[PDB]
Structures are given as C-alpha cells and as structure tokens.
Amino acid sequence: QQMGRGSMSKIVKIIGREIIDSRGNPTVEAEVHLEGGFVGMAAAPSGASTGSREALELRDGDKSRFLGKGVTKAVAAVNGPIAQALIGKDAKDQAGIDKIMIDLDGTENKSKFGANAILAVSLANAKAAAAAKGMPLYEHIAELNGTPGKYSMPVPMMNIINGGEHADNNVDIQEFMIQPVGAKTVKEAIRMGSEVFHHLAKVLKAKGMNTAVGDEGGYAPNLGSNAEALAVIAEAVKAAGYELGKDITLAMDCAASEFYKDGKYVLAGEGNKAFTSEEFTHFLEELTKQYPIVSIEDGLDESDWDGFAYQTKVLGDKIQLVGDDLFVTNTKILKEGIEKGIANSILIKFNQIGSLTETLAAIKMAKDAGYTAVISHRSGETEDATIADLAVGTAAGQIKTGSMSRSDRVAKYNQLIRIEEALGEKAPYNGRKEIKGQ
Amino acid sequence: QQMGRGSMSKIVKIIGREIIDSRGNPTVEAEVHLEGGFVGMAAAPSGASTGSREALELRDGDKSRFLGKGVTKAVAAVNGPIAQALIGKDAKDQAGIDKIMIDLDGTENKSKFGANAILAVSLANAKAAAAAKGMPLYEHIAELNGTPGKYSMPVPMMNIINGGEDNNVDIQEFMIQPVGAKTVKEAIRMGSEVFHHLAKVLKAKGMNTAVGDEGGYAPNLGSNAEALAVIAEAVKAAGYELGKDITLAMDCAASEFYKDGKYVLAGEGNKAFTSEEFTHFLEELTKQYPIVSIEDGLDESDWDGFAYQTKVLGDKIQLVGDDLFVTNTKILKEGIEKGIANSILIKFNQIGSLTETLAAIKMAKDAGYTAVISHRSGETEDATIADLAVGTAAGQIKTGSMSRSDRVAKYNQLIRIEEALGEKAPYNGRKEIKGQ
Ligand SMILES: [Mg+2]
Ligand SMILES: [Mg+2]
C-alpha cells in the first residue's frame, strides 16, 4: 500500500569531475543520484606503469594543463552521453548499467569514453544502489557477486621496500611486501604491519639509509642487491618481535615486464647481468629457499607466456604466482591462461577492465579454476576505499593496498577495521591458508 | 502539523574507535548519531613535533602495541564518559556540546580524556548537526561562526621542499602559493604543475624524489638557500613567473634549532645566530626571493625576539605563530597585546574543540591578524579543514604538497565546494596575505 524510498532507485543525475590522485595527477570522480535521494561517489585510480592490454585510461594530451594528464575529455563523457544513457535506469541492476556503458562506448578497450569515465560511474552507481537497498557496499557486492552474506577479511600484502622503476634504483624487483598471516583479525594484522613498518625505519636509519617513501608509502633506500631488501625486512620483523615464517611471510611484484629487453631479463642491481626466462625463474627460486617468499607477481614479461608456463610447472606447486600485467583483470586473457597452466592467481584492478560487473566475472573465473584473487590498488590512488568492501563482499581472501603510510593506502586499512568491527567472525581472518600453495 | 526528522537532533549514540594516520600511528575516530537518524564521523590528526603548550594528545604508552602509541584510553573516554554525558543533548548547539566535554574533563589541557578524544567527538558532532540542518559542513560552520553565507576559497601554501627534522636544510618547510590563480581549482593545478617540474629538476641534479609526511621532496641540498633556488627553477620550467603567479612561504620551526639562547643552523657552516642575527638572515632571503610569509621564525618562548621580528618585518611580511600560539585564545590575546606576529596557524587539535578553534579565528580577524587553517604531519582521509577554511572565510590553508591523499583529499574537498558555490566563494589571491 505504501512504497519505501528504497524502491525509487532510478538514476536522476550523474556528475563527473576532475580530482587529484596521490601522485598529483588528475583522475575522474563520478556522482550517481537516484530518485529517492540516494547518492554514490567513486574515483578511478591510475597505474604508474600499465599493462599493454589494460582498458584505455583516456587523458587530454594538452601540455598547457597538468603536463598533458588532465581527464576533462573523460569527465565530459560522464556529464553528457553516459549521464544521458543512464537517467531513468535502475541502479540496482549493476550488470544492466555496466552493459549500457560498454555498448554505448562500443570499442573493445573503452577507447571512446575512457575506462576511467566508465569505472567511476560503475562504482558510484554501486554505492547508490547499496544505499537504496539499505545496506553497506560490501553487503551489496556479495549479492551482486551471487554469494549473499559470504564474507572474509582479506590477508594483506603490504609493499614496504619499493624498487625498480617507481622507486630510486639499486633495487630491480618493484615491490617487497610482508603478509601478517599470524594475525587472528585484520585489525591485529594492520597493527603488526604498522610495527614492522616503524621498526624498518629504525633499521634503515641505523645503516644511514633514506626513510622517505614512494607512491605506495614504502621506503626506497639505496641497497647493494635485490636480496638485501629481504635482509633488511627480516631485521625489522625480528626487531618488532615477530617470527619470519610463522607470524609474517613475504611476497614480491617483480614487474619483470619493466626490465625485459631482447628476450632477456636485465638487473641493474645484482651485477648488471642478463637472464633467460629459465635463468630468471632459477634466481627467484633461490630467493624462496633463503626467505619465506610465498607469492611472486609478474615474475616474467606480460607477453612471455612460454616463460610463465615454465615458471608455473617449476614453482607453482609450492608458491602463489600472481598475474597482473599478464591477465589485466580480463576474463578473455585469464581464460586462455587457465587453459595453458599459466599462474595460479590474479591481481584484481577494476580499472584494468573498467566495470564492476567485468571485475566480479574475473574473481569468479579465478575462484572456479582454483586460482586466488588478490584485490589491488594502483600506484595512483585516492581517499576512495572501494577495494576494502570489494575484498570483503567477494571473500577474495587477499588484498594489496600498500605500506602502512599515506592515507591513499591507510583509508583502505581504516575501512577494513570499520567493516570487521561490524561483522566480527561473520568475516573470519583465515590467515596463511588464503595463499595459493599453503 | 508534522515534525521533520531534522528537528530530532538529540544525541542517542556516540562510538569511538582506533584507526591509523598517514604515518601509520593510531588516532581517534568518533561517530555521533542523532535520534532523527543522522550520523557524523571524524578523526583527530597528530603533529610530528607539537608546541609545548598544546592540549594533551592522550597515548596509552603500552610498549607491546604500536610502540606505545595506542589510543585505547582516549577511545574508552569517547565510548564511556563522553557518550554518557552527551546522550540526549542537542548536536545543533556546538558550543553547549563542546562545553559539556571541556567541563567533564575538567583539566586545563584536556589531560583526562585527551584532546584527540574531545576533538573527534567535537567534529563528528558538527557534521551530524550539519546533516540534521540539511546543509553541507561549510554552510553549518559559517552559521556556528556568526557569519552566515560568508565564504571564500583559501589560498593554499604547499610544502614542496621538506627540511629540519634529513639533509643540510634547517628550515622545516618551503612552500609555494599560487596567488596568480582566479580559482582554487587553478591554484591546485598550478601547484601540481610546479611539484612535477620540481621532480624533473631534482632528477636532473641527481637528488632523491621520495617524499616526507606532507608529500614534499626531502633531498640533500647544500644550503637552506638552494631549497629556494630549485623551487624557482621548477616555477620557471612550469611556465609561471615567480613574484606575480607564485609567491613563497616558509615554516622555520625555529624552536627545533634553538639552544643556549642562539639559533644554530646545522648546514650553512653550523653557525650560531642571535634573535636579531636570525631575523636579519630571514630578511636577506626576502630580498633574494618573493618570500611573503614566515612561520615560527623564532623559538615559541622567545617573545622578546618575536616583538623585534614583528617591528622589523611585520609591515612587509606575514609572520605566523604556530608553536608560539597553539590555536589558544589566552596565548594569542597576550600576543596581540604585545605586537607579536600578525598571523596564526589554526590547528583544531592544538586546543581540541571546534568552538575554541572558532574563537581563535575571531580573536585574530578582529586584531587584523590572518588565520591559516593547517593540517598536522599525521593526517587521515578526513577533509574537515577544507570546510572549516571556507566556512570561516579564513582566506589561507596549509594542507600539504600536491602528493599523498592525506593532503590531496583536502584540495579535492576544496574543488567540490568551489564547484557548488562558484563566485559566492571567491579566490581573492595575494590580498589574503598579511603585508600586501
Ligand atoms: Mg604488479
Ligand atoms: Mg609550524
């Protein structure tokens, strides 16, 4: 006899704007407004170095503004054609909404409107619909994902020694990360993260090394070899009074694409030597004998599929192997990968494919093949904490959202603490068993 | 004949919790819940070096947790005594709420519950009332401040070369001010552009482009002076004119290098200066570069020195009390009376309530002093100082370099606000700064 406000979930207004990411560069923010007075706001993150096959991040190319990195073109697409195509449609139909933007854009890689325009509206629509449905975003995502009320708190891998391209050289491997698998809650995990992060500062100070931080809030000191990065991390874990292996395991992103030239992998650090896919695989293998490294990401170039097949036969039984640039959150590429025994895990970045629907497809493909899904940030982040809710709503089991420094990283850790506060053991922290090969 | 929910603004629940700041240290978050189903949520920031007279930040000191930096005690204060005293009180009465907590704590420096506990509730209370009143926070603050509908977009001073507490740079912060911009959106773009050109400049010279707490560069430079030289090189490379388009600001945090009544610059020969000598050094720099604002140019306890610096430089230069005043009307009042400084840096966690913070902005404006709404080194995703800066038409903000979302979420909030208000919230540029 009386209709609730919740039932008036038709899109009435969509606003795009240009905001600033954690590196000082424009990205796109979108608002979605429902008839019933429900609003959702979201932002696109930005990769520092993107995979070849990522959906297109549309930039202006206008030198007089933000050194060419403005996104007004992408925002215009939000405020006009996308807005006009979504007014009148039901926010609660995520897949319906994503399809209308995919079909209206019409290109394979979202090159007309920008993956950055379409994702911002996709995520903002999702938040609006959650509000209209009277639930928090993690709860709405679980329903959109076809796994209602099924939650976990993800085991984080925290990038605390930056390297390679987007640090300051000496170190070739892009990210060394700690995973607090020994924690019984994500709050405890986050504390253990903070402590080892602070103890590492003391260690680097002791050696006269720089304790300023890179894009992901980790340290970029000048180190003799890729190895020594692990060394200093081991010192910090002991100095915090945690036990390497039991309380904290290690993970890496090689971003091996960045140091691949003429079918060979070239390390500035460790001598200056060139390695074959096989030789590089054996180098990584050695590190996993000296240290408890249980996850290695982009261990080879995105286009070295023979390489990845070899690395997967050799290491894949003992070690989680994570596709990032390899799979770019794309079900077409992940499907080819599963079928060729390539990796056993995927890094989930919604802006590599550019819609939440196509993102949840990727997690489902992964989990149904017995691959793990790690919900991931980009080097270029915002105060947006969407990946926190996504990790919880999909029971992904793992998250990569940075060091324990910079609010571009820590907003996600804060959101995970808020969410665990609501859910308690309705979202268990499952620890080491989340990681592929444990 | 029907009562709207806006009118049911009695506090029914307050929740405290331990979240993490931009340095990885715990801080207090508070939620305030009104009967009419309105919520506000806010966090306390934390300073890296505090002034000696700041309202106490309550830490647990429990060495087995966050290296003794837990805030479970302050959170307990929020969930127990503060919640219990505030239940059933009207959130819309910001002054009444802040009064109940200051009285219940009963100490001078909020040393019972902690300034982090009282501030988080103070700010969450404000936001919840704003919701009850059906208005954005800047609009509510303008009404709490006795200045209805009176807005400006603040001229930002952006810390892009860090120093003092890891190089030969004694001066804590070198800042650019895009005074030549027509809007805060343009000002933010100009700061992005200069910040990115500076990176190229530091790479070309082989210096480190990793960032400190406030998202600025921390390279090892020869002298304090070269900090300014590289900033000029970046401004020229970004196609902007030093003086006209971009002015410069410093924070000496001179308290940090003050020992046996002398000012000792470890780098510049490790030489020792008297208040007067150090004032003349700062004077020299304002002849070589368009430095228009100097903060804590002397120790927080050298009131003699500040009286001299204010005589010499006050007419031409904005002189900003940070550790000198700690956003505290008792101290600022003694400062105004003795012709000490002409500008105050406003940190709501230095005094620990919104009401006391609004009092400090009013004391200053009435005295012809400028107010600069500031962050702390420890920040969160919280963007309150944006709304505070617009609501009080303060005219200036220090909320960081154009890097790290702990900073950029403030610029982002300013961009959102300016989109709504347009020319109702003018960017007045250089005329905001004391001595222009
Ligand atoms: Mg990667
Ligand atoms: Mg200061």
Residue numbers in the entry:
A (entry chain A): -7 to 430
B (entry chain B): -7 to 157, 160 to 430
Task: List passages from the publication reporting this PDB structure.
Enolase, a multifunctional metalloenzyme, catalyzes the dehydration of 2-phosphoglycerate (2-PGA) to phosphoenolpyruvate (PEP) through the intermediacy of a stabilized carbanion. Prokaryotes express a single isoform of enolase which, in addition to acting as a key mediator of energy production, appears to be involved in the overall infection process - enhancing bacterial resistance, invasiveness, and tissue damage. Herein, we present novel crystal structures of E. coli enolase in complex with SF2312 and its oxidized derivative, KSF where the C5 hemiaminal is oxidized to an imide carbonyl unit.
While there is full density for SF2312 ligand in all six monomers, KSF is present in only three out of the six active sites. Unlike in the E. coli enolase:SF2312 structure, Loop 2 (residues 154–165) and Loop 3 (residues 248–268) are disordered and Mg2 is absent from the active site of the enolase:KSF complex. This major conformational change is reflected in over 400-fold loss in activity between SF2312 and KSF (SF2312 IC50: 18.4 ± 2.84 nM, KSF IC50: 7.67 ± 0.38 µM).
